[PDB]
């Protein structure tokens, strides 16, 4: 029960307008065959072109919505649309390209998928709302066979060249002409009433329908992400390391300790209300304060309404002391808050486009994150960069230039000259901080917060 049996039934009702007469009784086996491919009863790690929902969820980074529209089937030109916003026109002889034969179109398809995917995934998963032309177009740019490795590396093969008769991964694919051993999922098999737009638009106002192949491709992927990551959430699914996941996570731990430790020293709150992950630990364990936890799972859909977190009757008095929202996304933070809030608009390899302006942030786990909203922060200000240490000035054991900074808040800087230890630590913390920011996190704090109040914690 790992792979999708090719003897599983495929509902063909979605297909019968592009493919009139299609049998109601249909297997993957007979569909793959009808699509022009032969599986040759092959036990070589590619049991089925089509995959389960579970397999698709584990391979979310590989998702490319795909849609084909009859432009006028062998007779007529086809519009190919990918969730990259690319539209290509194939002739049998937002980006909108003119009509060209398949022999060139297949080259553009390999280049596009390779650039999109080489830093995301070892494969492609075409995400479909299958009506027939997409499935019957695959033979013109897809070759299948046994699992293979790259001719230039140890990564599984995703592309094939008819020029050289060789196989490459996404990294090594330049000049290759065929997609090799793609995967695919038909969203329409999930049990939906009515068309794509009627179903997409239930959940998302951000993607319109210009009635072009790339728009349906985007809607198809959006609806899929809605179904697998918004409405359904699984924090048991691990995802591979593909970037700076580990540095970013370490940075997050170090900034959080820094910022909260400073806020407590600066304003000496008698109570901190820690609102979010039910697994959360005291980020400043030595701090004098009354630490009070409130459980909230990450809101994958709409931001939490502060009315429903706080009221319905705790310390009850969240207006006492300070509220810590560390990636606990609410509509409008109270004025007495420390906040980390993920900016869904960031471009990274970790952040995939999501549903209704939100984004899918994949780092160990997948977190669909509601659209970043500036109005949430109206009672707060941006938290300026600073470094604070009360640790003793003492080197122990990295070559030096003397550090000069207004934001190095230490005894040594108070004394006019930053010691080597605090300068190493300062530069390390600044690097962590820059990592986290560029990874798309944003920091906000109560308006009264002033690093000037930290200097008198040394006397
Ligand atoms: C620990 C972790 O990766 N959590 C998160 C990252 C990005 C956005 C999030 N929204 O809630 N939790 C989020
Ligand atoms: Zn390679
Ligand atoms: Zn959408
Ligand atoms: Zn020092």
From Swiss-Prot:
What reactions does this protein catalyze? a 5'-end (5'-triphosphoguanosine)-ribonucleoside in mRNA + S-adenosyl-L-methionine = a 5'-end (N(7)-methyl 5'-triphosphoguanosine)-ribonucleoside in mRNA + S-adenosyl-L-homocysteine
Binding residues for S-adenosyl-L-methionine, per the UniProt record? 274-280
Cellular compartments annotated: Host cytoplasm; Host endoplasmic reticulum
Q: Which residues are the active-site ones?
A: 67, 69, 134, 211, 216
Q: How is its activity regulated?
A: Inhibited by Remdesivir antiviral drug (GS-5734).
Where do the annotations place Zn(2+) 16 binding?
393, 412, 419, 422
Residues that, per the record, bind Zn(2+) 15: 200, 204, 207, 222
Q: What is the effect of changing residue 19 to V?
A: In strain: Omicron/BA.1, Omicron/BA.2, Omicron/BA.2.12.1, Omicron/BA.2.75, Omicron/BA.4, Omicron/BA.5, Omicron/BQ.1.1, Omicron/XBB.1.5, Omicron/EG.5.1
UniProt: Mg(2+) 2 binding residues: 69, 211, 216
The N7-MTase domain sits at 239-459
Query: Where is Mg(2+) 1 annotated to bind?
Result: 67, 134
Domain named ExoN: residues: 49-230
- Residues annotated to bind Zn(2+) 14: 150, 153, 169, 172
Function of the protein: Plays a role in viral RNA synthesis through two distinct activities. The N7-guanine methyltransferase activity plays a role in the formation of the cap structure GpppA-RNA. The proofreading exoribonuclease reduces the sensitivity of the virus to RNA mutagens during replication. This activity acts on both ssRNA and dsRNA in a 3'-5' direction.
The annotated subunit structure for this chain is: Interacts (via N-terminus) with DDX1. Interacts with nsp10.
Q: What is this protein called?
A: Guanine-N7 methyltransferase nsp14
Gene name as annotated: rep
State which stretch of the full-length protein is shown: 5949 to 6449 of 7096
């Amino acid at each position: 029960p790992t792979h999708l049996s090719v003897d599983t039934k495929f509902k063909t009702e979605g297909l019968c307008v592009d493919i009139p007469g299609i049998p109601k009784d249909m297997t993957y086996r007979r569909l793959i065959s009808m699509m022009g491919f032969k599986m040759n009863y092959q036990v070589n790690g590619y049991p089925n072109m089509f995959i389960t929902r579970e397999e698709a969820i584990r391979h979310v980074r590989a998702w490319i919505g795909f849609d084909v529209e009859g432009c006028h089937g062998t007779n007529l030109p086809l519009q190919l649309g990918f969730s990259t916003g690319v539209n290509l026109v194939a002739v049998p002889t937002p980006l909108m390209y003119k009509g060209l034969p398949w022999n060139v179109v297949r080259i553009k398809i390999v280049q596009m998928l390779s650039d999109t995917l080489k830093n995301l995934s070892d494969r492609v998963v075409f995400v479909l709302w299958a009506h027939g032309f997409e499935l019957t177009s695959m033979k013109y740019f897809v070759k299948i066979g046994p699992e293979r490795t790259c001719c230039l590396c140890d990564r599984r093969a995703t592309c094939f060249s008819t020029a050289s008769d060789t196989y490459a991964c996404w990294h090594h694919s330049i000049g290759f002409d065929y997609v090799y051993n793609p995967f695919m999922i038909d969203v329409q098999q999930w049990g939906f009433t009515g068309n794509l737009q009627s179903n997409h638009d239930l959940y998302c106002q951000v993607h319109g329908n210009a009635h072009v192949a790339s728009c349906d491709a985007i809607m198809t992927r959006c609806l899929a992400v809605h179904e697998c990551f918004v409405k359904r959430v699984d924090w048991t699914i691990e995802y591979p390391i593909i970037g700076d996941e580990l540095k970013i996570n370490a940075a997050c731990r170090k900034v959080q300790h820094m910022v909260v430790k400073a806020a407590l020293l600066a304003d000496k709150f008698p109570v901190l209300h820690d609102i979010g992950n039910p697994k959360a630990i005291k980020c400043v364990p030595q701090a004098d304060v009354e630490w009070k936890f409130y459980d909230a799972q990450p809101c994958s859909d709409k931001a939490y309404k502060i009315e429903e977190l706080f009221y319905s009757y705790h310390s009850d008095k969240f207006t006492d002391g300070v509220c810590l929202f560390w990636n606990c996304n609410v509509d409008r933070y109270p004025a007495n808050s420390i906040v980390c809030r993920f900016d869904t608009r960031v471009l990274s390899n970790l952040n995939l486009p999501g549903c209704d302006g939100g984004s899918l942030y994949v780092n160990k786990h997948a977190f669909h994150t509601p659209a970043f909203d500036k109005s949430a922060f109206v009672n707060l200000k941006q938290l300026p960069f600073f470094y604070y240490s009360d640790s003793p000035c003492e080197s122990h054991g990295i070559d030096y230039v003397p550090l000069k900074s207004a934001t190095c808040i230490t005894r040594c800087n108070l004394g006019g000259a930053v010691c080597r230890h605090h300068a190493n630590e300062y530069r390390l913390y600044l690097d962590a901080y820059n990592m986290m920011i560029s990874a798309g996190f944003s920091l906000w704090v109560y308006k009264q917060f002033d690093t000037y109040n930290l200097w008198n914690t040394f006397t």
